Design a protein around this ligand. Structure first.
Ligand SMILES: *[C@@H]1O[C@H](CO)[C@@H](O[C@@H]2O[C@H](CO)[C@@H](O[C@@H]3O[C@H](CO)[C@@H](O)[C@H](O)[C@@H]3O)[C@H](O)[C@H]2NC(C)=O)[C@H](O)[C@H]1NC(C)=O
Lengths: 175, 55
């Protein structure tokens, strides 16, 4: 949660959303249902499988090298043949033990991105038409339903046309 | 030298490679354990490994 979102302010875990890596939950008149996404689910996983291909299955094929285990005390060259190979392992390790640290931490602020860039999208295609109820979930003024849902859940939403319930239930009702 | 396989004396192995267009010359007045020929010299990609794993 560098971007904040995940494990940030959406502090709840979506239990068993198996139809993908993302989605929504509509509380319309027709009851409920947690819907699955794409351009974000394929989006992130697009990248993860990208930095990875980079890592996994690639370089290095070396044939004849220096010996590294030794049967009798030789001194000098010996010492050296060690210290050289030792230094190698040693370095190569730190490169490894960080390729992870990095790729790993940023693997994160990459998922906690697609989130904080979708709620941040819905909250764009629709004006005063609704607001994320407090935090996490949203709040609607129209009687949106399963059919009406394929609006935002398809970016097919008019905050102009389908606007009727605006000021109203908002700051308009008694107080 | 210590008794090895009966014998108390021994041999010292040495090597010499001759590049195309050069001649080899052996000159001994004793103890020469001369060679019967040359081994071919490849460049390739081979090595050797101490391991007890089975093929
Ligand atoms: C220099 O000294 C060494 C040792 O003091 C001599 O070597 C010993 O030589 C004898 C024969 O000359 C070897 O004896 C045989 O040993 C076997 C092994 O157990 C046994 O089966 C035979 O019946 C016999 O006893 C003995 O192994 C060998 N010892 C060693 C470790 O070398 C060497 O010959 C001496 N050189 C000269 C010119 O004095």
């Amino acid at each position: 949660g560098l971007f904040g979102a995940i494990a940030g302010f959406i502090e709840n875990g979506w239990e068993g959303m198996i139809d993908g890596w993302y989605g929504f939950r509509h509380q319309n008149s027709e009851g409920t249902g947690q819907a699955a996404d794409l351009k974000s689910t394929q989006a992130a996983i697009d990248q993860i499988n990208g930095k990875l291909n980079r890592v996994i299955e690639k370089t290095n094929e070396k044939f004849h090298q220096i010996e590294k285990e030794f049967s009798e005390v030789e001194g000098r060259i010996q010492d050296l043949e060690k210290y050289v190979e030792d230094t190698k392992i040693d370095l190569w390790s730190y490169n490894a033990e960080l390729l992870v640290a990095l790729e790993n931490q940023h693997t994160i602020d990459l998922t906690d991105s697609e989130m904080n860039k979708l709620f941040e999208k819905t909250r764009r295609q629709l004006r005063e038409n609704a607001e994320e109820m407090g935090n996490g979930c949203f709040k609607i003024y129209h009687k949106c339903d399963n059919a009406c849902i394929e609006s935002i859940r398809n970016g097919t939403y008019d905050h102009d046309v389908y606007r009727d319930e605006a000021l109203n239930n908002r700051f308009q009702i008694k107080g | 030298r210590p008794w090895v396989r009966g014998l108390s004396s021994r041999i010292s192995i040495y090597w010499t490679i001759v590049k195309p267009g050069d001649v080899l010359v052996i000159n001994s007045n004793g103890n020469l354990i001369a060679p019967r020929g040359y081994f071919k010299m490849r460049t390739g990609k081979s090595s050797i490994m101490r391991s007890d794993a089975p093929i």
